[PDB]
Amino acid sequence: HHWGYGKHNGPEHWHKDFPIAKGERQSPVDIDTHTAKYDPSLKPLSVSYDQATSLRILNNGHAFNVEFDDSQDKAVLKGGPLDGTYRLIQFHFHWGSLDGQGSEHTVDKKKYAAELHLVHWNTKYGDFGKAVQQPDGLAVLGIFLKVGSAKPGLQKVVDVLDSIKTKGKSADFTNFDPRGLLPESLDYWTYPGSLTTPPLLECVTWIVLKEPISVSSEQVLKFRKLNFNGEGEPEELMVDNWRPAQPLKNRQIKASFK
């Protein structure tokens, strides 16, 4: 029936409705650190989020998205392996039912407790919907989360989860600054890939940061309290909304560092 992360509609079934699931540039992947090639020609990333305008937070039944106003060049990403400017449209997370799993990308097969995705679209395309039809339409910044100390900048998000518990619920969410979610270092790995949920389009340049951010156990616990279901439907906790690693096939992972 419709896709999700259960036994009957989980990632292993997606190819029946979205054949691109078995495509040549699917994500996520395992990052083998010894085989990633250092590329001295890659430039430092440029993150400009000082003018970021968040608007709302929504439970879409598969994760929670914080959405931003992308009608102008307010929060953009440029540099790194990118040509042109990419505007932030939304961020969301993938997490596990246990601390030993939850991330989509893995590093030398290591899984983290969660993974944050900041989604950006190439402004040359004019809108998100046109950008997903292009090979260089999106740029996703992925950041791993490990359990340790609490992340202060994530608390405003944790606190509103109670109000968007079930599928379809949304809440006003203004003045949230995503700079509070960045690690200290911007060193990264990059490779050409796809969206990690249906429609699985191969329109993404992935930028995965080497340095994880720490969150407290209590912070991650509140994520696991969300529901996949809609209000008044039987309760299915929102946990393990991550796609396993896909074959690298003909792609090279490049590193901005050595």
167 secondary structure, DSSP code: B
d(CA 108, CA 233): 40
Tell me whether residue 196 is annotated as binding.
yes
Stretch that binds Mn ion, among 109-117, 123-131, 153-161, 170-178 (CB under 5 A): 109-117
Nearer to Mn ion, 166 or 196 (CB): 196
117 assigned ligand-binding residue: yes
Nearest to Mn ion of 104, 136 (CB atom): 104
Q: Is 15 part of the annotated catalytic residue set?
A: no
Q: What are phi and psi of 72, to 5 degrees?
A: -155, 170
Provide, rounded to whole angstroms, the least separation between the CB of residue 92 and Mn ion: 6
Binding residue count for Mn ion, defined by CB under 5 A: 2
Q: CB nearer to Mn ion: give 117 or 210.
A: 117
Closest approach of Cβ 41 to Mn ion, in Å?
28
Q: Tell me which residues in 195-234 interact with Mn ion (CB under 5 A).
A: 196
Cis previous bond, 11, omega within 30: no
Nearest distance from C-beta of residue 94 to Mn ion, angstroms:
6
> Do the annotations mark residue 94 as ligand-binding?
yes
- CB-count burial class (<10 Å; 0-12, 13-18, 19+) for 7: exposed
Three-class HEC string of 219-243: HHHHHCCCECCECCCCCCECCCCCC
Are 177 and 70 within 8 A, CB to CB? no
Q: How far is the CB of 113 from Mn ion (least distance, A)?
A: 15
> How many angstroms separate the CA atoms of 195 and 197, rounded?
6
Binding pattern to Mn ion, positions 169-198, x when CB under 5 A? ---------------------------x--
Q: How far is the CB of 117 from Mn ion (least distance, A)?
A: 4
| Under rule CB under 5 A, residue 243 binds Mn ion | no
Cα of first residue to Cα of last residue in the chain, in angstroms, is: 46
- Dist. CA 258–CA 117, nearest whole Å: 24
Q: Is 166 annotated as a binding residue?
A: no
* 117 touches Mn ion (CB under 5 A): yes
> Catalytic residue among 2, 34, 62, 105, which?
62
Report the C-alpha gap between 199 and 19 in whole angstroms.
9
Cβ atoms within 10 Å of 16's Cβ, excluding its own: 10
Binding residues for substrate, as ranges, are 196-197
Residues belonging to the active site: 62
Binding residues for Zn(2+), as ranges, are 92, 94, 117
What is the contact surface with Mn ion in residues (CB under 5 A)? 117, 196
